[PDB]
Structures are given as structure tokens and as C-alpha cells.
């Protein structure tokens, strides 16, 4: 009967494994260099397209970390890629020297809702000018699919293939695959692992994108919960000083200047490098490799809706649903496309921001929802279970804030 109590405190901070709305890509088009498809080779070719590098410096220090070490670590990346430039054959992988900065970096409280997480979610729902999946990406069926299932899949794919949340899926699939693979292929090495994604422009040109790099620590992962540490180094045009509370976990460097087209003419903007230490485990990297299931899960939520409409109207409502034909007289989100991308964005953010706070909040808030709906239509301890999960997680706090909007109306 009353809105949830969200915790008071300093604003919550970014805790994703890689940058989301703030990421920046160095890209090469229709790659054709010798060794296309070897990540390190792709990364160096992406690096060469940029000529605006400059002497790096800290612009937003990590309050609890050793900021000279993060700076030294980025300078070591540039120098070891410069070493590779001198060798005749570019090696398949690059193992970093076990410097003191990398040994330190690799390890060898109530927060309030901040506006940035809602902004992230809005960004995840948007369309990008590139496609991130193939037409037949979704599904893993053994047999050929029926006509109706295919039609629904083709409609849905057309609405989400360019979605920003789909970029996050493929970005996450790539980096988790590369890290999990390096975790057993190079157990004792501080391996340099580029952060790559691949897309296709509106004109059909294939493109290869570099977001940055991670460096992994030692990884003798005997079980699913063993942690491999890593250091992430991610390009960005986001000035960390605008929302410093978001970047509590980062040392942020200024490392270059980039020339951009904009609504005014060409403009020069500083390029930043977001640096943090982080960790993940076998089981989280396996889930990261499965993020394409976000596409399947949200398609199935759509298909549930179409099947309901088909059962009430005694005919298949797929075309009527996706083309937006008591029949509904519009879409609350504004379009069928927005409903699909919103469902996907929720599913992807559930994965990007998985936590026990989210698992508890999801279960307990569903109980209070069904109860409040039953009281609404026909007219203590549960609240504690819900609010016990409202501590500091941006995604949980946002979903609780959404819940409270449901309670008001």
C-alpha cells in the first residue's frame, strides 16, 4: 500500500564489467590485412587508424588505488604494442611483462539512486546505425523452423539487430570468450586481450571495433567460482569530471584528442581511458558467453504476447502484432520496435548487472505486485524481504524506482 523506501547515501557508481553508454570504438572497415580475424592483429590495425595520442596523464584519480600504476600500465600497453610493430611477424598473442605496476594492479555501504543508470538503460534501448547479429542469430533449433516461428523471428530480429543492447550482447560474448579461453590457454601469463566487436554498416560493409584492452592475471581456475583478476582499459569521450560519483572504481586518464564530425563543424575532443581492476570467474564468463540468450528470452516474451492475442482472436496475430494493425489502439512505448528493444534491454541489463540483490528483488517484488494488483481490482514482512535487497546496486535501485512508479499508478 506504500512506496518502497530506497536507501539514502552517496550516489551509486558504475559496476559493469566494461563501459556501456560511455564506450568509444576505434574501427577498421571491410578488414583485409594479413591475418584478418586474429584479435591482436585487428587491435593493432584499429590502433593505427588513430593519430591523436598524446602523453597520458591522470584526470580523475582512483581514490583507493595506486594511480601511478594505472598510468604506468597504459604506457606499458602502448610500448609493448610498439615492440610488436618492430617484429617481422605479428605474434598471435601478446603476454605482457610482469612489471611491478601490473603485479600490483592484478593483485599478485548504502548508496542512493543516481540518474546515470536510467540514462544507461535509455541508451541501451536505442537503435545504432550498424547491425550486430546475423539474420539467423536467434535460436539454436536442430530442425527447420515452422513458418510462424520464422515470421516472428524475422520481425523481431529486424527490430533488435541494430539495437544498442545487441551491441552489448556481442561485446560481452566476445570479451568473455577471449578471457575464458586465455584463462586456460595462458594460465601463468599476463596476457593482453583486446576488447573487440564486429558489426555491419547500413551499406553492408563489415567493420571491426576496438573498445580497449584487458590484461588478465594468473588464472589457475580449478573450479567455477575461482576468480581471475584483470585490468580493463577502455576508450571514451566521456569526461569523468562531469559525474565523478559514477567513476568511483576507476582511474581515468586523458590519452589523446580526436577529430569529430558534429552538429557544428569538425571539433576536437579529448579522448579518455577508463582504467579499473576487476575480476570474474569461470561461471560468470560462461554466462557472459551465453548473453545471446537475451535475444531468445525477449523474443519469447514477445511470442507470449502474440499467442495471447492469437487465442482471444482465434487466428494468428503475428502480422497484426508486428505491423501494429476490444483491439489495442496503439503501443504504450510508442512502437512495436520500442517494446522489443525495451524487453531486450531489460534482459541484457539483468545479465550485465546480475547480482543476488537483483535475484531477491525480482522474486519478492513479484509477490507484492500480484498482491497489490488483486487489492486494486477488488477493493510488513514482505516489504523487509524486498527492501533488504535495496543497498547499493544501481540496476536494482532503478528497478525499485520503477516499481514505485507502478505503485503510484
Ligand X SMILES: OCc1nc2cc(Cl)c(Cl)cc2[nH]1
To 10 degrees, the CA torsion angle through 71, 76, 79, 84? -150
Contacted by 283, from ligand X, Cl ion, none: CB < 5 to 8 Å by type: none
Alpha helices in 96-146 (DSSP H): 100-105, 115-125
In angstroms, give the least distance from the CB of 254 to ligand X.
15
Is 3 strand, coil or helix? coil
Answer yes or no: are the C-beta atoms of 216 and 193 closer than 8 Å. yes
Burial class (CB in 10 A: 0-12, 13-18, 19+), 157: buried
Contacted by 48, from ligand X, Cl ion, none: CB < 5 to 8 Å by type: ligand X
Residues in touch with ligand X (CB under 6 A): 44, 47-48, 53, 78-79, 81-82
In angstroms, give the least distance from the CB of 189 to Cl ion.
31
Nearer CB in complex with ligand X: 62/94: 94
Count of residues touching Cl ion (by CB under 5 A): 2
> Which range binds Cl ion by CB under 5 A, 69-77, 211-219, 266-274, 292-300?
292-300
Burial class (CB in 10 A: 0-12, 13-18, 19+), 293: middle
In angstroms, give the least distance from the CB of 172 to ligand X.
25
Is 17 a binding residue for Cl ion by CB under 5 A? The answer is no
In angstroms, give the least distance from the CB of 61 to ligand X.
22
In angstroms, give the least distance from the CB of 407 to ligand X.
53
Is 292 a binding residue for Cl ion by CB under 5 A? The answer is yes
User: Apex CA 284: angle with CA 279 and CA 289, to 5°?
Assistant: 115
Contacted by 354, from ligand X, Cl ion, none: CB < 5 to 8 Å by type: none
In angstroms, give the least distance from the CB of 182 to ligand X.
20
Is 289 strand, coil or helix? helix
User: How far, in Å, CA of 377 to CA of 367, rounded?
Assistant: 16
Q: Which residues, in sequence order, are CB contacts of 65 under 8 Å at separation 6+?
A: 251, 277
Contacted by 79, from Cl ion, ligand X, none: CB < 5 to 8 Å by type: ligand X
In angstroms, give the least distance from the CB of 298 to ligand X.
38
Nearer CB in complex with ligand X: 11/256: 256
User: How far, in Å, CA of 20 to CA of 11, rounded?
Assistant: 18
> Which range binds Cl ion by CB under 5 A, 102-110, 246-254, 284-292, 371-379?
284-292
Is 141 strand, coil or helix? coil
> Which range binds Cl ion by CB under 5 A, 89-97, 241-249, 255-263, 289-297?
289-297
Is 153 a binding residue for Cl ion by CB under 5 A? The answer is no
Query: Residue 279 is placed in which grid cell?
Result: 575480476
Contacted by 185, from Cl ion, ligand X, none: CB < 5 to 8 Å by type: none
> Which range binds Cl ion by CB under 5 A, 126-134, 222-230, 293-301, 317-325?
293-301
> Which range binds Cl ion by CB under 5 A, 69-77, 127-135, 206-214, 291-299?
291-299
User: How far, in Å, CA of 56 to CA of 239, rounded?
Assistant: 15
Nearer CB in complex with ligand X: 81/368: 81
Q: Which residues, in sequence order, are CB contacts of 384 under 8 Å at separation 6+?
A: none
Nearer CB in complex with Cl ion: 191/351: 351
In angstroms, give the least distance from the CB of 47 to ligand X.
4
Contacted by 292, from ligand X, Cl ion, none: CB < 5 to 8 Å by type: Cl ion
Distances in whole angstroms, Cα of residue 104 to Cα of each of 17, 60, 80, 142, 151: 19, 19, 18, 48, 53
Phi-psi region of 212 (alpha: psi -120 to 50; beta: other; left: phi over 0): left
In the bound state, the residue with its beta carbon closest to Cl ion is 292
Answer yes or no: are the C-beta atoms of 277 and 65 closer than 8 Å. yes
Contacted by 53, from ligand X, Cl ion, none: CB < 5 to 8 Å by type: ligand X
User: How far, in Å, CA of 163 to CA of 160, rounded?
Assistant: 5
User: How far, in Å, CA of 76 to CA of 57, rounded?
Assistant: 14
Q: Which residues bind Cl ion (CB under 5 A)?
A: 292, 296
Amino acid at each position: 500500500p506504500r512506496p518502497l523506501r530506497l536507501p539514502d547515501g552517496p550516489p551509486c557508481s558504475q559496476r559493469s564489467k566494461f563501459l556501456l553508454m560511455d564506450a568509444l570504438k576505434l574501427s577498421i572497415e571491410d578488414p583485409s590485412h594479413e591475418g584478418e580475424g586474429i584479435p591482436l592483429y585487428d587491435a593493432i590495425k584499429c590502433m593505427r587508424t588513430f593519430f591523436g595520442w598524446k602523453e597520458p596523464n591522470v584526470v580523475k584519480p582512483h581514490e583507493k588505488g595506486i594511480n601511478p600504476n594505472y598510468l604506468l600500465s597504459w604506457k606499458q600497453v602502448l610500448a609493448e604494442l610498439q615492440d610488436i610493430e618492430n617484429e617481422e611477424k605479428i605474434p598471435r598473442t601478446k603476454n605482457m611483462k610482469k612489471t611491478s605496476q601490473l603485479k600490483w594492479a592484478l593483485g599478485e555501504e548504502l548508496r542512493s539512486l543516481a540518474s546515470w543508470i536510467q540514462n544507461e538503460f535509455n541508451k541501451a534501448c536505442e537503435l545504432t546505425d550498424s547491425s550486430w547479429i546475423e539474420l539467423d542469430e536467434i535460436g539454436e533449433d536442430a530442425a527447420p523452423i515452422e513458418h510462424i516461428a520464422s515470421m516472428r523471428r524475422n520481425y523481431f530480429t529486424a527490430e533488435v539487430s541494430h539495437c544498442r543492447a545487441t551491441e552489448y550482447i556481442m561485446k560481452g560474448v566476445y570479451i568473455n570468450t577471449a578471457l575464458l579461453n586465455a584463462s586456460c590457454a595462458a594460465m601463468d601469463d599476463f596476457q593482453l586481450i583486446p576488447m573487440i566487436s564486429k558489426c555491419r554498416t547500413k551499406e553492408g560493409r563489415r567493420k571491426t571495433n576496438l573498445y580497449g584492452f584487458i590484461i588478465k592475471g594468473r588464472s589457475h581456475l580449478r573450479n567455477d567460482t575461482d576468480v581471475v583478476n584483470f585490468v580493463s582499459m577502455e576508450f571514451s569521450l566521456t569526461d569523468p569530471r562531469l559525474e565523478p560519483h559514477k567513476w568511483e572504481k576507476y582511474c581515468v586518464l586523458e590519452v589523446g584528442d580526436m577529430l569529430l564530425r558534429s552538429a557544428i563543424g569538425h571539433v576536437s575532443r579529448p579522448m579518455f581511458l577508463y582504467v579499473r581492476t576487476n575480476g570474474t570467474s569461470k561461471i560468470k564468463m560462461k554466462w557472459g558467453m551465453e548473453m545471446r540468450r537475451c535475444l531468445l528470452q525477449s523474443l519469447q516474451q514477445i511470442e507470449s504476447m502474440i499467442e495471447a492475442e492469437s487465442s482471444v482472436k482465434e487466428k494468428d496475430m503475428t502480422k497484426e502484432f508486428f505491423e501494429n494493425k476490444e483491439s489495442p489502439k496503439g503501443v504504450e512505448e510508442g512502437s512495436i520496435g520500442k517494446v522489443c528493444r525495451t524487453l531486450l534491454a531489460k534482459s541484457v541489463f539483468n545479465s550485465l548487472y546480475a547480482s543476488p540483490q537483483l535475484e531477491g528483488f525480482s522474486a519478492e517484488s513479484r509477490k507484492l505486485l500480484l498482491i497489490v494488483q488483486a487489492l486494486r481490482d477488488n477493493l510488513g514482512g514482505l516489504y523487509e524481504a524486498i527492501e533488504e535487497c535495496l543497498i547499493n546496486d544501481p540496476w536494482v535501485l532503478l528497478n525499485a524506482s520503477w516499481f514505485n512508479s507502478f505503485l503510484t499508478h
